[PDB]
Amino acid sequence: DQVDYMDVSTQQVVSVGASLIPFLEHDDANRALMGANMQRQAVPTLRAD
Amino acid sequence: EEFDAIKIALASPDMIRSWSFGEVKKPETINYRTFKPERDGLFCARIFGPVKDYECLCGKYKRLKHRGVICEKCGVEVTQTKVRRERMGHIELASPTAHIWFLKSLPSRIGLLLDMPLRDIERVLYFESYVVIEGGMTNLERQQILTEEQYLDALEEFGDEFDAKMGAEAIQALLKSMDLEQECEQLREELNETNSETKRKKLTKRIKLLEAFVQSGNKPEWMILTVLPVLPPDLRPLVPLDGGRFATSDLNDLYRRVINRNNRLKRLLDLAAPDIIVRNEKRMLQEAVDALLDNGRRGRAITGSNKRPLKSLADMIKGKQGRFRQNLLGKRVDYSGRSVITVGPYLRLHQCGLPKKMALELFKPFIYGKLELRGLATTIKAAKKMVEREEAVVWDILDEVIREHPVLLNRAPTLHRLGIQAFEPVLIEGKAIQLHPLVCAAYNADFDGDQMAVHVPLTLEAQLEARALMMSTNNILSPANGEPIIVPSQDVVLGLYYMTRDCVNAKGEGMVLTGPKEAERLYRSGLASLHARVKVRITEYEKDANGELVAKTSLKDTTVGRAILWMIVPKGLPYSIVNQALGKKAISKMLNTCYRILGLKPTVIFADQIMYTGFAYAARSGASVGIDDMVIPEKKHEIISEAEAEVAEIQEQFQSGLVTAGERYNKVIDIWAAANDRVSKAMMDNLQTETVINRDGQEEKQVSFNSIYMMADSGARGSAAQIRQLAGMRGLMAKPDGSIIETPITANFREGLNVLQYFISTHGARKGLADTALKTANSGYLTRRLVDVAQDLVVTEDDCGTHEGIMMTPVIEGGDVKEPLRDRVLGRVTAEDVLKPGTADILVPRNTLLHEQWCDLLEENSVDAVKVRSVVSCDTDFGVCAHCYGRDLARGHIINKGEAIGVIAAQSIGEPGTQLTMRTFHIGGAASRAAAESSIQVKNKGSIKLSNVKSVVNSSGKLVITSRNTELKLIDEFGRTKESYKVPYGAVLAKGDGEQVAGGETVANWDPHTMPVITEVSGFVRFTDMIDGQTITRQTDELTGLSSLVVLDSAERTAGGKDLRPALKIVDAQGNDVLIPGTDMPAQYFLPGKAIVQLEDGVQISSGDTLARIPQESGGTKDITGGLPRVADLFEARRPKEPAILAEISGIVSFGKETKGKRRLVITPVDGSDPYEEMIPKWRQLNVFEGERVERGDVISDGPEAPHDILRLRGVHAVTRYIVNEVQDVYRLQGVKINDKHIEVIVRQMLRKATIVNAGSSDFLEGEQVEYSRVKIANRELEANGKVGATYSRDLLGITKASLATESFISAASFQETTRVLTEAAVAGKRDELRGLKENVIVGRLIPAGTGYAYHQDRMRRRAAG
Amino acid sequence: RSPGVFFDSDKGKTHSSGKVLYNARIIPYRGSWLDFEFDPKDNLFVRID
DNA sequence: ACGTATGCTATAATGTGTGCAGTCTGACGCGG
DNA sequence: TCCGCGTCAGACTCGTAGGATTATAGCATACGTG
């Protein structure tokens, strides 16, 4: 009865950069940060895989 | 071009005219279409010279046919454009203008010389009030300011007889009239009368300025500029862009502001305009001049086009972005290339991959050279094209020159000398550099996208220097610690570990082999595992008494893998070294052993072979990272669930109102801290020996071959601390503020964090990575600060001829010996014959280096304490001797004379701090402290030996200690210190002084999260100066009503009870005081701030009861972030805000007079008849209790020790022993290894200057503070000639100040305060003769150290020979 | 920083006194600043801009 | 003649302001 | 001489990236060189 509201999804804490990382839950926030920072630096390849 | 010194003096208006080749009279830069100088403009060729090499403007005289011809029409000479940056100009100022650097650069200088304040002078300048120059009629005296009202009064009344004027004109006439000869004598006379501190300081400084000003030959009028120099136009360029735009420096713009206003003043003086306007024009003119010299200083810096401030002159000499740091000491350099580095696992140590196309461009002049020799190129543009076409036969020539040619490889940042190492380039087709794995440690080079700069040593000397000094093979051990930095890691360690490590039976257990070759035969044949115990016949080679090697053949029970590793092992080391399972820590000893025994060659080979076999067998293993490998212990959910209910219990007790918030905060940390270590150990206990399932007959227990464990146990990557997060518990993270989150992370990385568990993990992660970026500048700035002071130190003499040394003892702190005496006193020259226990025969000579083998005999004899020849005990003037320093830890034997230590020392100190502020700041993110020091348990049996202890027995029957720095020793059978502890104040001892204890007995016990105030006498408690609301507060509960009292400090205290000291006074049953046994002190314990008290007024007490409990909140992981500042403060010599008092001279203590609790002390020494009084606070407690035999510098108060207080009293070897212990304590907390001699270097430099006390044969006199070396050279001639000795007293100097003290002003301005350094050096007229490195690196000469030491001294004999 | 009013206190301007000196500050979207601040003797002061 | 430079106009008008304001520890330097 | 508050000094080292302003009358003799 004390609960008034609830988080809608489980992804609202994070951003777009971080929502693309799978198993973020099993990753240190220091390496998670670098991982999302490098995912932005990913040059698209010849054939989109 | 080759000189001796550089001088700085004041630019006279007449002097400025000597450099100037003309007067710029117009702001006109160039004509708009004809891009050419204008008539006597700022780019005038009639003043600054011609545009091109030998070409006049109009074009009448061209090139060298008209060598030095001056044109008629334009009036321009025909010399090189060379002169356009050499030739200067000037401007004839209508009215004189004041220099901002001799007005605003404090001290005032112009005001310090006149004995006149700032306001007074400025209000004269901006025309607010007149100033008297000289009053004939003594009515008005000199330097007396008169407002616009007061000038008019004297004009009609007195007038004429008084001369007073306004603006920069007046102050110049004041400077021009003042007599330096007379006002020097006047000040000396006033000094003889009754001199104080401030009065004598002011007088002596002015006195020296006045004498300095006369001897510098400077005149105080040059402070005001009648002439203003112009910078050469090429040094303030107006050059055109490719895009048809132009671009000009901000100087040109600032110059046009000066000339316009100056010419407008000439115009207004032609018109005889009213003075009100002339005033504005003069104020403007000064604003422009001051803005030109130093823009942002006097007022708002004149902003320009892009709303930004104009860059002035001073700005190009000022700080980082100045010429010094940016365009002189640091340079972009030719024969230089950089590229992404990648691994070079095939290379040897003395090799590195260099791309072809890189080395191609780098060695361009060496190709053209070898080409003309072969006759393939006739000329150089022919050779240029041959290279460009990249034809086949040019690759083979490039390949020829590069062989037997070293290259320098640098990685940023350059922390220590090993940040550059030289190799023999190996051309590789690819844009990547390939670097040797073992030296990756020195650079800290991770192949994750690192780039390393290449540099080619051009000169043959540079090729020899690179091969001799900077070669990777010649650089093994760190200079900081005598320890190998060239040591495998990562794969290499793991591979050897896999090899050596053994297992049960396996294939072919207990077999029997001819050699370690049959072991390779059987393993690779598929009929034996590397983990099989088999008897093998190996023949080990042991060194004898001489150089000959003895051979011994025997049956060794090892493993197949160990046997194969013996093949790599050179013959000279024992086999017992590879008989163990090898790890990183074991491997580091193999190379060190190999080095100390065989030499250099054997080690380089060994090092490489170790690396090769390491990688190869690591890859044969197939070591992996499955998720079944991250094993969580069986009973994690069992530990936590009930460790949570543990914390939930106290939470309900707190809201009830007994356990306070601070006690709960420390109490909950202890529960989690136990649970965290509980889960950590259950993990490794289930993970280390997970292999409980073996064979042979039925079973056996064995080490686990879990991939992750092997990778941690071997010491390859990660540790027990990391695995905790993976399979165990992540642990408690740290906030970005510094406080630790009460709720830690329960989950690990296998099970997966929930949404918050990650949100929580962020707080500690961001703050840990914030201190990686921001905190690094303080540590790197320390390196800079240390270096400058330690630039000059170089090994000069071979033997200083001094007896003085430094007694060192073994660092035995925290039971287990922290640092052995052998390691402490290693490679340091003795100062005293140190023999064995039985004093009847010598064993170690006085002047002899301590090799590791000589130190081994110190262990047999068990040396007590040693006087080592230290750096600070050196008598060598301008440097040190090789004996004082001892061995070069990097090399491995006695240091070369000429090697520049100071820089090596500074680097060694700043590297660890700068490296421990980024390694566990990017990979960590959580606190790991365990400050639950509840109780000392003694481990070996001994007699209890306390020292510096004053205890008292309590009601319970327990020895309670009432002294702060109590130490506890552990004395063995014969009578020597084995273990040592710190017992704190109010601790309960199990057994008192002299009593026997057994092993594993709690000898001491106390509460860590509390600092009790314990009594020495029995009776009742009285409240004194404990008024509710002013000094203390009160808070009650319910039914009965137990109230606690909390003492407020000056922060939470009103202005009413500020001088009231709150204390719990002891009284008897009658109500009178109770004297403390054997002292005239009525019992009164002063409670400090935030002191929680449970007993209220009128409560009976025995001796040993706790009156109040002072909270001890300190749960912030010091790490390196909050430990470097303390290092800096020590070096910078900043006295603490609670220094401890010490006795000056030895004699009889005699307590004296008092002032409302403020205690004095009338000490009357036995020899010294004149008493000495010093004052003491009330709340502060002393250590001595009056009437005593005190010596020089006994401890009277407790707290932090002031570095100045130590040298002032207890001499040099006391302050050196302090800093060295204090500094190392901070680095030892972090596991940073530094030899004490490196700190001793900086200490020595901090003892550079010294104040003189007593008049000498030279005009020293009192108040002067000269360098210690110069005054001692005067004492050399004094003891020979007699005359009057110059007695002294050495002073301690902070780093920042010790750098600005050195006679070299170039070294000082190159550092910081550059605006001040130059002005002080100009007024003094000082000439720098260059001794330091910074000095000769600037001028680009030979460094008076290292390679250049042999050369510089060969020039010093040119000076000596006539 | 959002315009309006804001209450802060330098937890020890003068650690000499170690007194938590409380201060208030009116931050507009356009206009001059209006601050009120105490002192060691708890005298209210106003410092426009 | 060509380019640059100097010159004069006649209602009355007569004191400017503009713009970033969570830095911070440490160290002196003028009054009070 | 001591306290309070004003100014003034620092804050690691190398690599890469790209752009844009407003306006000053209007006309008639005076000054400098082919």
Ligand SMILES: Nc1ccn([C@@H]2O[C@H](COP(=O)(O)OP(=O)(O)OP(=O)(O)O)[C@@H](O)[C@H]2O)c(=O)n1
């Ligand atoms: N802002 C930075 C980033 C990096 N470095 C340099 O780059 C090195 C490596 O940084 P990084 O690869 O991020 O750290 P590692 O310790 O290699 O950790 P990781 O496992 O995350 O790669 C640092 O030690 C340092 O020499 C630096 O000086 N300043």
Ligand SMILES: [Mg+2]
């Ligand atoms: Mg890297």
Ligand SMILES: [Mg+2]
């Ligand atoms: Mg890396």
Ligand SMILES: [Zn+2]
């Ligand atoms: Zn010409």
